[PDB]
Design an enzyme around this catalytic site. Structure first.
Site, short mmCIF file in Angstrom:
data_model
loop_
_atom_site.label_atom_id
_atom_site.label_comp_id
_atom_site.label_asym_id
_atom_site.label_seq_id
_atom_site.Cartn_x
_atom_site.Cartn_y
_atom_site.Cartn_z
CB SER C 140 -0.96 -0.20 1.20
OG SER C 140 -1.48 1.36 1.28
CE1 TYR C 153 -5.43 -1.44 3.85
CE2 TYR C 153 -4.29 0.62 3.48
CZ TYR C 153 -4.76 -0.48 3.16
OH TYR C 153 -4.64 -0.79 1.69
#
Lengths: 248, 247, 248, 247
Positions: C140, C153
């Site tokens: 990510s 996250y």
């Protein structure tokens, strides 16, 4: 001036041995009141005896979800709410990938990743009220380099890096910096599997730029740096204290 | 741990901004400081503020012909330096399609070649003492490309690996080598940024704290890297940037 | 030929939408049999219809520990043991630091970090018997950059980087590579709060070097690159597919 | 079709040996016309014979500032202006820090850092007119890790990383991506390593896979970075190193 911690309260997890113990020693020597957190009282009392009346001891399992509220109360009891939080508690089960168990994995994630977040989150409101706070997470050589048997540990230590950045993004506007120190190889609880193997210790020492492994005193300056006014404009950083292990 | 009494520091780029503040901080910690710059009067201002622990040397540290006398003159007032802070730098701001031979060459000569050859000249006396500190200046453009910075970025990415290489070569002899990476401070290399209020505000909002640096922000890091406190820290880049790179 | 996946079987998690779905399409177009894994059948059936007989669908909660053994059996049933594993399932609860709940945190860790490890671990033995395997984890932008609302996250995506390195260290000697692909901003399950706000999408697009956000086709080449013979000597790497977001 | 280079022209510097040579073979096999650039005609002729009519050879010193205009013209002559630029030319003098000479340092910076920038700069205008371009720089394990004797080399290889990002920031809006491949290989630039069997053995054991690279290992990566497959990959370092950097 810059490295003076007089009037400050520090909580150190994993304070009964190795790097957490020395961190408590260093912050107390800098004028801080220190709360050492560990599972077993007797080592905490030894540490408090060495430090004297500026040290208090709290027995707690910081990975325990049920225990969090009481752990926070007991930490805050002797000297008030802490200004400084050093998360030196950690575990490496040493389970290689094909041998990892549910329990070894879960205990590593609970202690190394989840515990620092929820403990910091509990303490941030008082720091924000004061407008000043220091969070020191413990990174690792396995934040960037995979060693035999370290898959869960590495997962959590790579996690700690981004978690440190995230804590900075959330809380540094309120005067709370969040940084992570990444020790190399030191004689600690989490090593000695390494420091019992003279040959591996020699290889690891030769992998550094300096040519030696760390001694506990090596961590005094860095810890103080990250826990004081000196590092006010340093936040969200990983600081490797590893003799150049990562430079080669 | 942070006492520099009995140590000698040389700071290049000492007549303004971050190099100037570095000289102030190291002198305040008890070091003798030699400020190096092209321009005498600012150096003398700095020496007056510090007093007798400060000496001034006028030199172009990028000049190859000049290296030997630059080294001699630095060594003259207080002896060979133990601490070397390479805060001299240039950003020509030439965007890629506008880069000239001269701008590129001047950026590489000052930002990359000069710290190496200057450090190399000073390493033997540090090794004889068994103790030495090298601080290079990295940048946000060590990892992040900004408009107009292609030559500058080349040299500042180079400074990162150069710092590691200096560690690999010299840290066995007690010489650590680290790079401090300031964010946006009011300095010589800036004010293109800080005299544009909107740009300074955007840059401040890009940090985790929400502000740009003040010179005092650099006192602790510099002293950290120049003292006994960082003996087992070497070959590292330490960003002093309020979390700019964390976001 | 370097990019020919004929005779290979791929399992893709999160396959019913966004990047997992496109990955299944790309690998099937390269000649692989694909097993798409997701929670609800109807979308997987749509995907299988688009692909035809090279696609099979498995309904499973890959985060479920109880379910792991049958999840693995069901993945293996249609075409045999997979050679390629693409872990595109993920969640971002978007809870900011001071709002994080136990359940949001635990669900993020369970799906984003623990699931890829235990699923890969279940499948590695047959890859090792064949001597060939590809594991693609999803990194990510929050592997390295903290965005608002991303603390859990981000923790898991920083974890995924070192986990990928650890998987390489454990399994690449047996012919199994492990790399992580790091998408920037694409229109997907996990980014529609982002792609839903036109101004934020424009800001994110301006932060790239190219000047645009991703389209799904942007992932075809990278996915194929990491899943084929072409990447035989690439392992333990993070490959950002982000238009230069991280370069600026 | 993602990896088809039909109708594209590639220039590869350092094409007469090792990785540049293999890159030329790979891009030609994918349908591109290739121009190999090297100092000595005869190895280029061997390469061109192996490839056939899709290959042209240009003799030039790409570090030569005087030579740049002519080098560019000669590269563009056989097949037109290139769409793909692969900068495989490099030097590692292997001078350790205390032994570095002015000339070794200057030649490392001139070939490894300045040459890729000025050659790319010469070729970008035609790429921008086509709206499509690929620049592949060569990073290194010494982009991040200091090895014995590599201080100048490391400086330039850390520089190549930020230079690649800067090239992305400058030129990717026009359809030109810029990435760097970082090989962990029997090449011109590594034979001091591969003529020492024990050193090759440790190096192989330091990877995740357990082996050093073979030239074929670079076929997929080069193609990936030089084709339509990588349209949304820019400003990245892609290590092709068997996991050397993961351990």
């Amino acid at each position: 001036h810059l490295f003076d911690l007089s009037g400050k309260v520090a909580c150190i997890t994993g304070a009964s041995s190795g790097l957490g113990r020395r961190a408590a020693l260093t912050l107390a020597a800098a004028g801080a009141k220190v709360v050492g957190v560990a599972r077993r009282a007797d080592a905490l009392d030894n540490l408090c005896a060495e430090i004297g009346p500026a040290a208090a001891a709290v027995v707690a399992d910081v990975a325990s979800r049920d225990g969090l509220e009481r752990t926070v109360a007991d930490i805050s009891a002797p000297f008030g709410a802490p200004d400084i939080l050093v998360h030196a508690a950690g575990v490496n089960t040493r389970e290689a990938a094909d041998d990892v168990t549910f329990n070894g994995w879960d205990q590593t994630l609970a202690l190394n990743l989840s515990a620092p977040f929820f403990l910091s989150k509990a303490f941030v409101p008082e720091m924000r009220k004061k407008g000043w706070g220091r969070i020191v997470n413990f990174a690792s050589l396995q934040t960037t380099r995979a060693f035999p048997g370290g898959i869960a540990y590495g997962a959590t230590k790579g996690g700690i890096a981004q978690l440190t950045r995230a804590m900075a993004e959330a809380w540094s506007p309120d005067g709370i910096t969040a940084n992570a120190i990444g020790p190399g190889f030191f004689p600690t609880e989490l090593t000695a599997a390494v420091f019992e193997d003279d040959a591996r210790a020699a290889r690891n020492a030769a992998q550094t730029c300096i040519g030696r492994n760390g001694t506990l005193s090596d961590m005094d300056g860095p810890i103080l740096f990250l826990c004081s006014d000196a590092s006010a404009y340093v936040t969200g950083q990983v600081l490797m204290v590893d003799g150049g292990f990562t430079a080669k």
